[PDB]
Structure formats: C-alpha cells, structure tokens
C-alpha cells in the first residue's frame, strides 16, 4: 500500500427488488493521505440517490487512509491487508429504512480490490431516498474505531448526515464489524477516531454520471 496504489472497486446490490451494480477505478496515496475515485453504474438507472452508497463505497476501505506516526503501528486495517478482511456493515437511516452490507477487501496480485453486496429494507414511497431529493453535495465526518478481542475484530461506529433539497438533514447510524481473513498479527488499536473530508465533482466530457470523488482521511 506504500506509495501510489491503484484500486478497482466493483459491487452489486438489491433494494426493494431493484438490482444494480457499480464499478469504479482510481488511485490512492497513503503517504499523502489522498484518494481519488471514479464510479459508474452499468445499469441504466440506480434506484436510490448515489450519496447513500457513495458513503459505503468510500468507507469500505481504510488501507489508503493515512495515519500519524504514533498510530502507524496501532492501525489494524494495514496489518490485515496482505490476506484481506471482511466487513459487515449495518446502517439505520432516520426513517428512510436500513442497509445491510457485506464487503471483502484484499490486495489481489499487485492491486487492491474491494467487493460489496448490499441489501436495502424498510423503504416506502414519498421518502427522501425514494424521491431522489438528496443533493450532490457531501459532508465531512468522524468515525470512531474500537477493538474487540472476544470477536477478534475491529468495530467502527458513527453518524452520517445526508442532505435533502428542501434542507432536511438525515442522521443515519452506521455500525461496522471487521473480521481479518488472514491469521497474522492483528495489532488491534484500543480507540481512535478518523476524520474524513470528501468532495464530489462531475466531468462535462461525458454524458455518463461520473461521481468523480476525492477523499482525505486522517486518523487521530
């Protein structure tokens, strides 16, 4: 992961009987703490707003995220990179329903790969996600990370605020559990918080929805 590393993330998911898959490519610089990505849905239309899944596609991998020198040994995700890890994420939206996702992240060959399966439940018409009222903007966030020896895994928690055209703000609870596929040393950190700052842009060159995405994630 040291230095510039390319990444290709492909995933598929089902929401209320609607199946859609998204594939994307980009690169991350852990030394500079920067991450650049470009996604696209092979399906004609994606039923829900993109941001509710941009968050999942972004926070599915933490290897690229930079950490301070004191926390370099503390990181668990980098330690498990050689043999990968599996994340189970539960997201409870504020009355918009629930996401249940399972992802696998691993360094295949000499390139990093992430795959995700998503299920959406408890969705009703006239909702924010159903109505596509969410704008294209995003917000920075903080994610808290804590160890768990009983499950031999790292658990993350936080709240994500998504925006609505009328201004309505949806506070959704995000919980993550990680299990290292490998049998190596975990080096699980006791407690630490990562601040994420993400900005989204579009390329007028193509008619296809671009979702050109930039992250700067720093631990503390």
């Amino acid at each position, epitope marked *: 992961f040291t230095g510039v590393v390319p990444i290709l993330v492909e995933l598929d998911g089902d929401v209320n009987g609607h199946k859609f898959s998204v594939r994307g490519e980009g690169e991350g610089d852990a030394t500079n703490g920067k991450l650049t990505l470009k996604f696209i849905c092979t399906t004609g239309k994606l039923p829900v707003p993109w941001p509710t899944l941009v968050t999942t596609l972004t926070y599915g991998v933490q290897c690229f995220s930079r950490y301070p020198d004191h926390m370099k040994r503390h990181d668990f995700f980098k330690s498990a990179m050689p043999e990968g890890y599996v994340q189970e994420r539960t997201i409870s939206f504020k009355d918009d329903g629930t996401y249940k996702t399972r992802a696998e992240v691993k360094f295949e060959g000499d390139t990093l790969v992430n795959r995700i399966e998503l299920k959406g439940i408890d969705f009703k018409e006239d909702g924010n996600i159903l109505g596509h009222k969410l*704008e294209y*903007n*995003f*917000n*920075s966030h903080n994610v808290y990370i804590t160890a768990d020896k009983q499950k031999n895994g790292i658990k993350a928690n936080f*709240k994500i*605020r998504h*925006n*609505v*055209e*009328d*201004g*309505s*703000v949806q*506070l959704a609870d995000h919980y993550q559990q990680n299990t290292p596929i490998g049998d190596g040393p975990v080096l699980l950190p006791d407690n630490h918080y990562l601040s994420t*700052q993400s*900005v989204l842009s579009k390329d007028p060159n193509e008619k296809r929805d671009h979702m050109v995405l930039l992250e700067f994630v720093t631990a503390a």
Partner: nanobody
C-alpha cells in the same frame, strides 16, 4: 478563499426575541442552501434549521418548527434567523453551515436563555 462569519448571539430571558445573522465571503449565497446546526455542551451536534438553495421552502426539526422563521436576501449576502418564542432547550449553541465544494463550518456564536 471562502469564509462564514455569524454574529448576533446574546443571552435572552425566556419569552424574548433574538436575531442571529450569518454573513458569507468568497462565494454567492443565492446559488446554495444554508443551514443552522445546534449543539449543547457535551452533546452531539444536530441540525435545527435550514433553507433550500432555491429558497422556495425551509425545513426545521420537530421541536423548533415554526420558531426559527429563517430568511435570506441574496443582495445582502447574509441570512437572518429569528428566535420568535424562546424555551430553555435553546441553551445549546448554534453553528452556520453551507458546503460549496468541500464542506465549510462557520465559527458561529453561543446563545443561552438562562
């Protein structure tokens, strides 16, 4: 490049009226939505009020709906929030938010009913 400066914070006895004002610099206000969050000492931040980019409608939380009665003027490049009725729950402090490109938080001001 861009900055947000909010003022007008002052202590108010219950039943009084207070006006907060958030001004912007380095970007237009008419082309983007505006928002006002609130957080109490030692409490998680929460979105109390806000106003859509188009300005046709404004959205509040369950408790404060109808209290804030927010307003905006494009030429002034400043947004105004009116306390209207006051309750002790407003002891928490306020923050002014508008995210063009990368997200921006304003320093805001602290207001407590006492």
């Amino acid at each position: 490049q861009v900055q947000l400066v909010e003022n007008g914070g002052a202590c108010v006895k219950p039943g009084g009226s207070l006006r907060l004002s958030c001004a912007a610099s380095g970007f237009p206000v008419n082309r983007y939505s505006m928002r006002w969050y609130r957080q109490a000492p030692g409490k998680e931040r929460e979105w109390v009020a806000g106003m859509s980019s188009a300005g046709d409608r404004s959205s509040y939380e369950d408790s404060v709906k109808g209290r804030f009665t927010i307003s905006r003027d494009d030429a002034r490049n400043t947004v105004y929030l009116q306390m209207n009725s006051l309750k002790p729950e407003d002891t928490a402090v306020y923050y002014c938010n508008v995210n063009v490109g990368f997200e921006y938080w304003g320093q805001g001001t602290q207001v407590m009913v006492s």
